[PDB]
Write a protein that binds this ligand. Structure first.
Ligand SMILES: CCP(=O)(O)OCc1ccc([N+](=O)[O-])cc1
Lengths: 210, 211
């Protein structure tokens, strides 16, 4: 069973460096090249480089010449990619990609998310969204000014929720959540969004007031 | 660098369709082309290598074709797992380069958005900020244009839009639009309007409140 098991999510400050590992198993390690691919803004894939683990010899995309440093440890069957002097533009998902040296047939690792930012960890501000008629009512919570990602939004602990992807307002995240409930149920009973942010150890309930 | 132009960049399709994705290379690549799938919330899987050879565990309904500089991936009778992203990759020259991708999305019936507008909370106003929020929920197709209006006149600065992916239960889309102001700026004006244009209605859907 071919496995390419990569290291975990990374968060770093600009100017810092990071080293991503790609543990291979279930085949002869030196027999295949190892490639590294960057995926950013969803749709943009770029080949960073490869390494032939047999020679230890490396080939680089021009664009990544001094950004990336691919090595292997032939003894632990592990490929590494080192990224240096990290910028905001380096935040992406990185994949190791084994390729057949003769056919270009490929097997991909699970990917590693890197986030480069100057921000220190910051808990969210959570603002209720109540309206200023109909048989259901939509309410929301605006989860503002937190770092890093991510947060969990839960409504009365428990379907009919939309959770919108976070966006980066000036070094800091914001996301909103909506819920649709019966008008007979609110304001007459309590509706609360709970926002958990692991990184800052915060859990906070905001009741939706009319 | 070899450029790979991939067509189309997204397409709404149906189960049982025959779908063709094209990949045009800026020079002949001698069949040194792969096709790749990324299913939603997953990594990548190789489908085809050297133009026309199926990777392992790829069903027969997938085929690749073409030569010189012009290549294509055909999915015969599209099945549920085939709702994914597809990419070509060139390996005739260094650097390897990729097509921009193709998303296959689920075609379904049109649905009007349910639109809701929200004034700033008291607590945020306390912070000096004022975020007006508009949800547009459970609409199809995905294309929707949003405008904010302050006292019947548009504002474009400080608007932040986030779209959902295709919904796992009704195949619709939803999005939020947030207009961020200072309290100062906010206090000056009275009427706040979120205005959506969408194929399901030849007039805008407007949602508004009064301060
Ligand atoms: C000529 C044999 P190779 O150079 O070992 O593989 C070609 C290759 C490399 C990378 C990718 N990829 O998707 O990142 C696909 C195909």
């Amino acid at each position: 069973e071919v496995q390419l098991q990569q290291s975990g999510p990374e968060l770093e400050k600009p100017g810092a460096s990071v080293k991503i590992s790609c543990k291979a198993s279930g085949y002869s390690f030196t027999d295949y090249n190892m490639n590294w691919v960057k995926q950013s803004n969803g749709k943009c894939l770029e080949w960073i480089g490869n390494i032939d683990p047999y020679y230890g010899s490396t080939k680089y995309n021009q664009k990544f010449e001094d950004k990336a440093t691919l090595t292997v440890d032939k003894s632990s069957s592990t490929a590494y990619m080192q990224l240096k002097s990290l910028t905001s533009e380096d935040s992406a998902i990185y994949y190791c990609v084994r390729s057949n040296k003769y056919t270009g047939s490929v097997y991909w690792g699970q990917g590693t998310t890197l986030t480069v930012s100057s921000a220190k960890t910051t808990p969210p501000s959570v603002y209720p969204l109540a309206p200023g008629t109909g048989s259901s009512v939509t309410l929301g919570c605006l989860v503002k000014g937190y770092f890093p990602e991510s947060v969990t939004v839960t409504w009365n602990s428990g379907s009919s929720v939309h959770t919108f992807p976070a966006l980066l307002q000036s070094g800091l995240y914001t996301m909103s959540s909506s819920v649709t409930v019966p008008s007979s149920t609110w304001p007459s009973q309590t509706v609360t969004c709970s926002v958990a942010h692991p990184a800052s150890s915060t859990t906070v309930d905001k009741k939706l007031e009319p | 660098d070899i450029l790979m132009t991939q067509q189309p960049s997204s397409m709404s399709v149906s189960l049982g369709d025959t779908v063709t994705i094209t990949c045009h290379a800026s020079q002949g690549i001698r069949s040194n082309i792969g096709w790749l799938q990324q299913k939603p919330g997953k990594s990548f899987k190789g489908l085809i290598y050297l133009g026309t050879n199926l990777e392992d565990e790829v069903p027969s309904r997938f085929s690749g074709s073409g030569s010189g500089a012009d290549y294509s991936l055909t999915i015969s009778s599209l099945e549920s797992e085939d709702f994914a992203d597809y990419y070509c990759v060139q390996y005739a020259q260094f650097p390897r380069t990729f097509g921009g991708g193709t998303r296959l999305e689920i075609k379904r019936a049109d649905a009007a958005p349910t639109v809701s507008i929200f004034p700033p909370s008291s607590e945020q106003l306390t912070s000096g900020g004022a975020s007006v929020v508009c949800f547009l929920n459970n609409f199809y197709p995905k294309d929707i244009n949003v405008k904010w209006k302050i006292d019947g006149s548009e504002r474009q600065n400080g608007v932040l839009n986030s779209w959902t992916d295709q919904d796992s239960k009704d195949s619709t889309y939803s999005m939020s639009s947030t207009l961020t102001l200072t309290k100062d700026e906010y206090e000056r004006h009275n009427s706040y309007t979120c205005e959506a244009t969408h194929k399901t209605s030849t007039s805008p859907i407007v949602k508004s409140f009064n301060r």
